[PDB]
């Protein structure tokens, strides 16, 4: 599924998303749109490491889900990485907020680095009702 953006804030809001471990709903928006574009579907193998990126949060498989094709990997979301292909995201959201209960916080996915981190994200929420 391709969310469009007001429908995913709302989405997220209603999951716990807005301020979870300190995290605004823009911040979370704007990781969604630089990771995936929005899709759950989303996803990108690693040939470097042979791992691979899923769904809407685009999350590794070396140490988020399982895939049972990531060498030496681990699953602390416990999840199988086909869970973070849902329309529903549900599972997606709570392996994203298992991800930031670590040190690094939102600062795990280095597409928010690049393109969230101060910048100015309130565009991602505006008129959206969150």
Not at 33 to 49: C, F, I
Not at 73 to 92: G, K, M, R, T
Request: glycine share 8%; net charge positive.
């Amino acid at each position: 599924k391709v969310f469009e953006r007001c429908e995913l804030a709302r989405t997220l809001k209603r999951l716990g998303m807005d301020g979870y471990r300190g995290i605004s709903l823009a911040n979370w928006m704007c990781l969604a749109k630089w990771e995936s574009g929005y899709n759950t579907r989303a996803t990108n193998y690693n040939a470097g490491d042979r791992s691979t990126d899923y769904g809407i949060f685009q999350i590794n498989s070396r140490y988020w889900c399982n895939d049972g094709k990531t060498p030496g990997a681990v699953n602390a979301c416990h999840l199988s990485c086909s869970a973070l292909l849902q329309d529903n995201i549900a599972d997606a959201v709570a392996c994203a907020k298992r991800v930031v209960r670590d040190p690094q916080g939102i600062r795990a996915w280095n597409a928010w680095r690049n393109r969230c981190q101060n910048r100015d994200v309130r565009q991602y929420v505006q008129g959206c009702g969150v």
